[PDB]
Amino acid sequence: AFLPSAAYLTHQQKVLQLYKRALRHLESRCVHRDKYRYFACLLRARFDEHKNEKDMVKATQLLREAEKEFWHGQHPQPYIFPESPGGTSYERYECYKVPEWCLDDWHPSEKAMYPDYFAKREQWKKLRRESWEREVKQLQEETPVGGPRTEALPPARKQGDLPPLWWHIVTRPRERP
Amino acid sequence: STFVAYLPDYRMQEWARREAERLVKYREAHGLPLMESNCFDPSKIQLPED
Amino acid sequence: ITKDMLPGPYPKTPEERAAAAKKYNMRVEDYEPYPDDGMGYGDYPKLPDRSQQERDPWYDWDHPDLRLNWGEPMHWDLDMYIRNRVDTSPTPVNWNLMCKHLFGFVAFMLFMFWVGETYPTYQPVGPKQYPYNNLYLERGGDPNKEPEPVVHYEI
Amino acid sequence: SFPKYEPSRLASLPTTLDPAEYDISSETRKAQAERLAIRSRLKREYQLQYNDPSRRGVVEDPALIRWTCARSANVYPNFRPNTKTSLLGALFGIGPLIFWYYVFKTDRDRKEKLIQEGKLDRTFNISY
Amino acid sequence: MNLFSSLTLVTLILLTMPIAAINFNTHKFTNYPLYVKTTISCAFITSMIPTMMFIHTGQEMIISNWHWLTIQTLKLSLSFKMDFFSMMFVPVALFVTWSIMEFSMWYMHSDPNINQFFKYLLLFLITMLILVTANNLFQLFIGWEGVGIMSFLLIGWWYGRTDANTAALQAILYNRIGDIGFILAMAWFLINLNTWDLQQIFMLNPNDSNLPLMGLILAATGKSAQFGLHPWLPSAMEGPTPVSALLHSSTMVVAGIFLLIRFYPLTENNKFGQSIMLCLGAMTTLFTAMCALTQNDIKKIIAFSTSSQLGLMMVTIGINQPHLAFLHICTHAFFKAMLFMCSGSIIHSLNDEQDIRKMGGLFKAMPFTTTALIIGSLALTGMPFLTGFYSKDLIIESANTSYTNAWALLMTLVATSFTAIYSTRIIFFALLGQPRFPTLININENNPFLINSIKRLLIGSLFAGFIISNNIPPMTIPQMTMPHYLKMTALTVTILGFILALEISNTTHYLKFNYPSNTFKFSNLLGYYPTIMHRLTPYMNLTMSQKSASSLLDLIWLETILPKTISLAQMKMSTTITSQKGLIKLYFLSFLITILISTTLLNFHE
Amino acid sequence: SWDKDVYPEPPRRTPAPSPQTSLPNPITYLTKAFDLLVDRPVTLVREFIERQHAKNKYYYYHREFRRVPDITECHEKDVLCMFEAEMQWKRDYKVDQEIVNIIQERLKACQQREGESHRQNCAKELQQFTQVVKAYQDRYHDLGAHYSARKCLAKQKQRMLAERKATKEAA
Amino acid sequence: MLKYIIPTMMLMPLTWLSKNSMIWINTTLHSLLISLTSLLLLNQFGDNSLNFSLTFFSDSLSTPLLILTMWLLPLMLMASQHHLSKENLARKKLFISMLILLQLFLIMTFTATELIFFYIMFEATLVPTLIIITRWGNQTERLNAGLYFLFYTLAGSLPLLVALIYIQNTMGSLNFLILQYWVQPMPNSWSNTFMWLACMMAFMVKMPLYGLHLWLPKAHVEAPIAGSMVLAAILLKLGGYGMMRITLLLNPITDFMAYPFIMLSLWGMIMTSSICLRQTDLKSLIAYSSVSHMALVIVAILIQTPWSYMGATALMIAHGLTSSMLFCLANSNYERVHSRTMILARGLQTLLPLMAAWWLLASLTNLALPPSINLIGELFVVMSTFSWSNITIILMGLNMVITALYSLYMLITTQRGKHTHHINNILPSFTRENALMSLHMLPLLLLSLNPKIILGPLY
Ligand SMILES: CCCCCCCCCCCCCCCCCC(=O)OC[C@H](COP(=O)([O-])OCC[N+](C)(C)C)OC(=O)CCCCCCCCCCCCCCCCC
Ligand SMILES: CCCCCCCCCCCCCCCCCC(=O)OC[C@H](COP(=O)([O-])OCC[N+](C)(C)C)OC(=O)CCCCCCCCCCCCCCCCC
Ligand SMILES: CCCCCCCCCCCCCCCCCC(=O)OC[C@H](COP(=O)(O)OCCN)OC(=O)CCCCCCCCCCCCCCCCC
């Protein structure tokens, strides 16, 4: 029950996430593609058999017993994507993700090696500092009484202005610096 | 560091080697033992009666 | 910062409990301080006591290295439950079964090592024969003391 | 049927196996509602203080200062000497000291007694 | 005489010179890794010359050149020892490092800190060449700590990654336990034998040397990653692949076995130490065999493989056969370094994927890597007349016909079968079958650096064992009169293991699903050893650090008994004294009471 | 140069090279290359340096210490004689330490020189090492970090008292 | 010793008659010249100590401490000229005069041939230190830190003076040259028991000893950088020097008397290392590491063997240099992030590479990597305490692990990992700071070449 936009996980998202995790663990269990395809079709049959179940508490009990079934027979070491958390290559390049504001501390001698890039950087900084008050006034007039309810940010609803709090998401370092 | 490196025979640590290089060459030449078990001469020390 | 935002004594009245819950930025029903047994904790909340590895890694955390937000109350043992340190992730195998299996494995192989040490293996040969009174002079023996004569015969 | 998982101190229960997660009562939904409200308000304050172009410094977190002050400077005023604390202090303060003193005294006495009778091997021990 | 010492010290100076070159830079270095590689090749030739000098004559040297510190009776001097072990280890390590740095010049091309990487690798090589040529225990301890902390830095190369720093700290912890053992051994040696030089230790020849040998065994358990202190070596494969291939496979991890090799005149007399260390080696090789049986991450499999090999050389050390163990040191370094090189090439060709379950079909995609991997696996399993035959077969022949433990011999045979099993498991899964990688194929290995390094290590893994085994002089009587069933035992066990694992790999193709058993989970979760020991002991130590040491004693009780008691007593006495009402009558009544007390009770009028 | 008597070395016997095969060993060729390229320039430079040394020759001497009365002829609490006795004892302590270091050097050199037969060929060096270690232990050991001449005298007096008691109980 | 006292006293007319902003330059230049001239104290003989006059003498033990003090003063002036740039000129001159006076008392303490003169300077070092801590600190708790630092030390030192005066009424003199020849054995009695306690508890307090160490985490983390340097690198060695001078008169009662303090220190090193494993503050971590190292020096002095004394003085010099470097690192980080939390500023290797190299080198010298003098001292103390008993090595060895468990930890949380997102005032490293760390480290790395000058008066 930890989501950025919502406060809880519904039944449909629980079933979909259980299906995805079960299929991933089944793919980890059998190495070859044809055996995985056969057993994935079998699991798709098992999930499709109980699709049209209008009894809500029966769906809840089916979810509980399916979760116990998945926990009983999951792989001890499932396959993890290299960029996924817990992978071999996870957060490896965070030692090269230098933040942009370090360029504000560069010497003028080494700032002359890239003139046009720093001119465009000055233009970007001027745009940010001229749109900051407009976007904070947009935020302060749209947030309801008692603070925001969710973490969803409003878009730019006018012409010429930018979406609020756009700097640190647009100017984030790349995945391969 | 140059002054420390060229210290003139610190704590005579070299000298105690060189004198020893003489002294062994004494007592090995005349059949004397290398070192006696008594630091001082036993003839010039008086023990209490027991 | 100011004086009435720092932690204080253990709350007793429900109004003090509500004020401490508002100070720590969470609900009153979820604000459970440490029991006042005199250990020095005070009004610090008792968080559910799990490591930071159990947090969601795909959420847009304010501190993705530690998987922590801004303004959220920290654990009393947050320096112990970082990802560089002790982890409390749910294991696929129960803890007691793992401990009993490891102890049984180690104890069984130690016992069998002792049993094999009691009954060693070898090859059907006599002792190796060395010349010159089992090499008395070559073993560092003194040349003045004549060794006891050991004679090996042809077979 | 299937072996149920036993929760442990160093092996917590899985989130998907928690029975309390599957409750769809009104009170749990309300609790999630103001939990999300508090989290969203704190996040909004943080990212409003964080994206300021005029600001050049550290965004101060009151939670970090609160934790560091509670860990160090707020231990003695919340302490009362009772049976539990006195027993723990007597067991952990002077217990190991007495144990190590007895062990080292016994070892040194045995070694010295071996030295006086000449049974201890000191044939080459001239550096001490 | 003027050529042996001169060439060996100029090898040391030539290796240490590029560190001074990189420490005195102003511009950006133009092809610094090429400079380091050329330096290492020249140093390898310069080290190879005294090796053939020792092969021809048999010259050994002691170079006590710099008198460092005379402390009463003890004298510490910069002493270098040139003997059989140093002369047969230095060119092998230099050749392996040459191939590793060429492969890393191919592999680490895109990293902006490649110069720092090569400086770190050269510093590691310098510390190891300090350690292996060390004469006294102080220089050996210097090399010990140098290679330990260089391993720490090279594991934590990617400092933005959590698991790299965690594994580096774990390796530091286990190496410090090994340092506890080393310090205990050095303490016993100084107290009882009044020396740190190895010549006097070998001359005096103590009889009751159980304590220093136990300390050395603990040090080797810490450094060579034996049972009890193993998991740092499997976790050390979180770093870059050349770092693994050099340090954690061929050079650094054999330092404990090298230390036990050097102390063979002391452990020749002891039988208790030999029995303990044989049992420890057998436990290590069997446990790492079951751990490598059912692993999926390839570098973890080869980590458990090299720890099993370390257990095997400890086993043949414990049967009083040190020179066969040193031959296995060189041979295992060769084929294990080349196997890691092939695995790194395969990983780099598949977009940084280290999982064997998403591989396959690479028999024809990468033919050179396929050939070299097949040759290395054959040499590991004990293919006759390769590198691995000339050490492992003699080791198991000496272990068979000897007065040893039966259980350790049985487990060594089972571990040999399991090595064969996981070797053909790697061959089947990584190389044969059908492709399983993603659709965008960028398989390429035609860079000259990778091809040349794999080619040199392939020539080494084909002929170096034969050349060394025919060049070394005898030191012990080899065993040649054995019955027929004991002579063919290793080949039969390897063949049976290959057959069993081929049957397993054939049965994995069937369309049948099985629930995971307890044995598979035991062999897959690393014997439950990193799950229990890395969660229980840090928790206990940190909770005793906080709930008992920090918060209880030194923040409350030590702050309560001394300062707060007198503080509160002085406060109470100050409040009691100065609480008078200011009345004259009470003051003069107190005067009268004072006079009454002085006159009668205290007898001040006498 | 050094002293061949205080630092002995047994006579060297190098066997003559008597090769059997016709293959030329590279060691002789590399020895010739080392003698041509390396040995001659170093020898020429050292000869030039020695020639420059020979123009300006100056001497340094070994300091000679005359004998002063020791602690056994010093009155109680008279600093002007126990001071000199203490410094003479310290100088003798350092000389004795370097003597034991010389014997240790002899033992290690014998062990490394005699090779695999070191157990038999270096018995005399081992016995000299044992004798000098016994003398050093009986003379200077267990004095403490605050050692002085008086502590050594007290230890010696205790040793002779114990020896007299032992030889009285055996007669 | 009049050739070193007079320039130190003349430093005050230099700092009071200087220009409006030339005080730092002149004081640094002339204190560096004094440090250069300090090397003439290396005229040591194998038997005789260097005796100057009836009041001042220099053995081979006081000489490294004197050289370290006169070397530390210019580093102190360099360190304490960034947070005082906003200060008044008169207050700046007062601070420089306080540092000069403290250094003068320190170099007059070590050369005193009379124990009363040594004790007088040993307490005279209290007033400038207390004034600096209570005036030029940053937090509130410095006021509390002005009490625990003071009334601990005097509580150990006011009985001891009485014992010293008793020696003046017993042996007839307190001159150290006389007492080396007029010493008497101490019989076992309650009077000699309490005289041993009086003569030792001051040096156990000022070292500090575990249990009596409570003033050191408080007086290290509220004090400014110059105060942290003077407590860590010099003022903790007054206890060791006093122990080494006073152990001569307390024989042979020390053999059965040193047991409880040896056990206290042998458990306190483990306790303080475990505390270092869980400290949330950098400055408190360095303070508790100092407590652990000084407990090791206490054990070394108490077992009183030549190897133990050698390891004790080597450990004293090495720990002084390493703790000074660590405190300057912590001061630079505090000046850049304006907080003392360890977990606040992470991943600084991606922003300061050279400061990361200095951090790695300082943490390397902290865990005694060979062949540094830290390893030399700790190794020799380990050899001596193994000679003392065969079990204590365990209580050493485990401690070593915990050392490598926090120092690298002190590295990692400050250097490695993802950098924090909301901190954007991380300036590049100044030339003054890098000069400070190089001047701290290069003598420490150079002393490994010739350690025979820091191996005590019985080398
Ligand atoms: C002392 C207490 C206070 C401490 C703080 C002091 C602050 C003030 C500091 C003043 C200046 C420094 C004083 C101490 C100087 C110590 C150094 C010194 O002089 O030593 C004397 C020693 C003296 O050597 P020696 O004693 O053996 O020689 C006999 C004496 N002389 C020189 C007269 C013949 O100097 C050396 O050892 C220098 C040797 C040559 C230079 C170094 C060559 C090798 C360099 C490294 C090569 C590569 C190795 C591998 C690297 C791998 C990568 C890491
Ligand atoms: C690339 C350019 C190179 C230089 C070009 C110009 C010079 C050319 C060559 C000529 C050089 C000068 C003549 C020869 C050298 C001098 C001869 C001499 O007596 O020198 C004095 C001494 C020789 O020793 P010694 O025996 O004379 O001094 C003993 C001194 N006492 C008695 C006080 C102890 O020093 C050297 O020769 C320097 C050795 C340098 C190599 C070692 C460096 C070690 C660095 C790390 C230190 C820590 C080690 C820890 C481990 C220690 C062991 C356990
Ligand atoms: C020949 C004799 C052989 C004898 C063999 C049997 C005896 C020895 C048995 C082993 C003892 C050591 C192992 C237990 C402690 C291990 C501590 C450690 O560093 O664990 C590693 C752990 C990281 O591991 P991991 O979880 O895999 O990390 C990847 C994350 N997924 O690291 C972490 O999580 C970080 C933890 C940092 C703080 C560690 C605090 C605990 C330290 C305990 C040290 C105990 C030393 C005892 C020395 C005694 C000497 C006499």
Instruction: Return the string of H and E elements of chain B.
Output: HH
Biggest β-sheet description of chain F: none
Q: Helix coverage percent of residues of chain F?
A: 55-70%
Radius of gyration from the alpha-carbon trace of chain B, in angstroms: 18 Å
Give the amount of beta strand of chain B, in percent.
under 5%
Count of DSSP strands of chain F: 0
Number of helices of chain B: 2
Structure characterization notes:
Chain F: Pfam families: NDUFB10. Chain F: It is found in: Mitochondrion inner membrane. Chain F: One of its GO terms (cellular component) is mitochondrial inner membrane. The structure is cut from a larger assembly and holds 7 protein chains of 7 kinds. Chain A is an all-alpha fold and 177 residues long. Chain A has helices at 11-29, 33-49, 56-72, 108-111, 115-142, 167-170. With 128 residues, chain D is an all-alpha fold. Helices cover 55% and strands 0% of the residues of chain D. In chain D, 17% of the residues are buried. In chain F, helix 2 packs antiparallel against helix 4 (123-140). In chain F, 63% of the residues lie in helices and 0% in strands. Chain F is flat and about 80 Å long. By secondary structure, chain F is mainly alpha-helical. The chains are: A mainly alpha (177), B mainly alpha (50), C mainly alpha (155), D mainly alpha (128), E mainly alpha (606), F mainly alpha (171), G mainly alpha (459). Bound molecules: 1,2-diacyl-SN-glycero-3-phosphocholine (2 copies) and 1,2-Distearoyl-sn-glycerophosphoethanolamine. One 1,2-diacyl-SN-glycero-3-phosphocholine sits between chains E (66-68, 76, 78, 138-139) and G (371, 448-449).
